């Protein structure tokens, strides 16, 4: 049949890509950084403990100021905290109690959030009146929203339960581009520092790189073991890291088109709910289901330290723009800040 | 100086605290439920607020959004080849690392698919209603025993199952969920003081 030939052309082309990847393969990052000394045993003290939530926290996001952070809880609240003084600057009630993602535009003006409801609610902060009402409700997605990020005060990119990732327009309120072709529910995404390309991780053990201007995926990294839950860009616009439900972090490179390092011990059997880098890209922080998060050496594949202060599973983790502290939110309705 | 703006921030914090306290009172004063097998359905039962949520428009894959329902009082699970899928669905939800502390309520809405229905005997402790033949009653009890074998296989997380029958009108089913929810809440309190 002609369909079998189509499948034949696919498997033979995949083999060619795999051969090309193995052809450009050389001494990996493992043995060329042997002379580099280890980062050394570092400690991470819990400076603050942002309490006040009721249900489990699911997402968080810093701001350009690197002192105000927004968090979302399943109890139907969206609280914007002041990390320096630990004061709730705002507390927005959500029309839907189930929220799984919250974003903070890079202007301290708008705040997006989504969850089981396919609608993505964007709230305005600098409102003329005291109340902070709903500025816009983006609708059209056919699946639960898993992660949304702000490109600017006019555009917003969101991920949904459906494979389609859509780039919206807050002014017109209609989808401008619909990235598709993942075959799985996109769990999260990561915006490059240059805001030209962005990667996305789904539950098919693959990561796709999409250009915001066009709708075609540039590359496809499939070297994981199970569904990818978290993904973050390296702070240089040339690499990124991913995490799946196998306690295995993978550091992929854009130009190499293959994995560089795998971070996994032999005494931990858990998932990876969050992934983030430091300001210099040397410390790779990743949360697990073992009630604590770890920090690995991005160039030595060695465990730099362990941050264990939570009483439940860590669900969100984020580093500031300037990398002064680390905010981690777990399912115990407690959001801590490590520095 | 910074003193004025600090009290304005402090007064704002005190305002959120005053609001969050009342929000916590109404939140803890109500219970949330899940119906599977998002549309909201709220109703009161003897001055007890219930918030039943039904997942809608979501894809078939449920290994991710089902985790958001960890802190739920009870997960109502209805059933209908046609049943073996539901059997495995309950089996997969029962011994899950995240839903191990969440109980499940069963609302049960043939010989070809299951061969055990041949040499199976009706339990002597049954309560057969004399309005129907023993054929259907033996069928419901067989499905009940099958679901129980899947339930009591592993109770590590210590979560219970409540099998019920759809023998009455909906207004009577609400009373059932109310009694089951009360039982689950009481058992939790009993284990919170280390009595059971």
């Amino acid at each position: 049949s002609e369909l079998d030939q189509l499948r034949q052309e696919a498997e033979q082309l995949k083999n060619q890509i795999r051969d090309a990847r193995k052809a450009c393969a050389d001494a990996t990052l493992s043995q060329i950084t042997n002379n580099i000394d280890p980062v050394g045993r570092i400690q991470m003290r819990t400076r603050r403990t942002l309490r006040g939530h009721l249900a489990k926290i699911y997402a968080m996001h810093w701001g350009t100021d690197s002192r105000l952070l927004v968090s979302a809880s399943q109890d139907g609240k969206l609280i914007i905290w002041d990390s320096y003084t630990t004061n709730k600057v705002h507390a927005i009630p959500l029309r839907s109690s189930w929220v799984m993602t919250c974003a903070y535009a890079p202007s301290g003006n708008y705040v997006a959030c989504g969850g089981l409801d396919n609608i993505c609610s964007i709230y305005n902060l600098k409102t003329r009146e005291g109340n902070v009402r709903v500025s816009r409700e983006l609708a059209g997605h056919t699946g639960y929203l898993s992660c949304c990020r702000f490109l600017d005060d006019n555009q917003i990119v969101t991920s949904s339960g459906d494979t389609t990732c859509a780039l919206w327009d807050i002014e017109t309120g209609q989808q401008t581009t619909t990235f598709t072709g993942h075959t799985g529910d996109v769990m999260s995404l990561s915006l490059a520092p240059d805001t030209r390309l962005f990667v996305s991780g789904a539950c098919d053990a693959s990561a796709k790189l999409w250009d915001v201007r066009e709708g075609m995926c540039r590359q496809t990294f499939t070297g994981h073991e199970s569904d990818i839950n978290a993904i973050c860009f390296f702070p240089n616009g040339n690499a990124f890291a991913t995490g799946s439900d196998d306690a295995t972090c993978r550091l992929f490179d854009l130009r190499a088109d293959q994995e560089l390092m795998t971070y996994s011990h032999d005494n931990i059997i858990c998932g990876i709910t969050s992934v983030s880098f430091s300001k210099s890209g040397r410390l790779l922080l990743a949360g697990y289901d073992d009630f604590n998060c770890n920090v690995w050496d991005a160039l030595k594949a060695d465990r730099a330290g362990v941050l264990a202060g939570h009483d439940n599973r860590v669900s969100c983790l984020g580093v500031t723009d300037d990398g002064m502290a680390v905010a981690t939110g777990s399912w115990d309705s407690f959001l801590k800040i490590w520095n | 100086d910074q003193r004025n703006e600090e009290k304005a921030q402090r007064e704002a914090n005190k305002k959120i605290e005053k609001q969050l306290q009342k929000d916590k009172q109404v939140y803890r004063a109500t219970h949330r439920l899940l119906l599977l097998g998002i549309f909201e359905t709220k109703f009161q039962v003897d001055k007890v607020n219930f918030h039943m949520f039904d997942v809608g428009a979501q894809r078939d894959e449920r290994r991710k959004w089902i985790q958001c329902f960890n802190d739920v009082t009870a997960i109502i699970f209805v059933v209908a080849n046609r049943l073996q899928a539901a059997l495995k669905l309950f089996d997969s939800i029962w011994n899950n690392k995240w839903l191990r502390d969440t109980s499940v309520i069963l609302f049960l809405n043939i010989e070809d698919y299951f061969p055990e229905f041949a040499r199976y005997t009706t339990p002597e402790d049954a309560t057969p209603e004399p309005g129907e033949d023993p054929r259907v009653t033996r069928a419901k009890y067989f499905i009940r025993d099958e679901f129980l074998r899947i339930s009591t296989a592993s109770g590590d997380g210590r979560h219970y199952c409540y099998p019920h029958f759809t023998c009455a009108v909906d207004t009577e089913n609400i009373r059932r969920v109310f009694n089951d929810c009360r039982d689950i809440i009481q058992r939790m309190h009993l284990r919170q003081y280390e009595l059971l």
Partner: nanobody
Amino acid sequence: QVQLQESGGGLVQPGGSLRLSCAASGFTFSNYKMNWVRQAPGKGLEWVSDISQSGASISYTGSVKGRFTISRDNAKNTLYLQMNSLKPEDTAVYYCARCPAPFTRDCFDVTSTTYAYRGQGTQVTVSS
């Protein structure tokens, strides 16, 4: 790249036997519980059998209780399903499914319409 390539199938008269080996590659084998799911012509996906990591609690569906038998090999990364006393109604596309979570006794979406961890197995005809 996780992929599951299987063999066997074809046409066999009713009451015969058949052996399908699902060669799993691209992932560690002795960490997930492999399952078998079929899709009859004109019907949806259904669960047939399963097996643990090493194999201690093997389960089958009522329709195949006692007829089929499932076995795996962690050394060769293979998954076999021997058939005995076929039935004319057993014709279907038998897929090879891998549960998403390792070290877990449960797994969802095994019978979902779309599943990235499926082997796209061949059609197996039982008729005359």
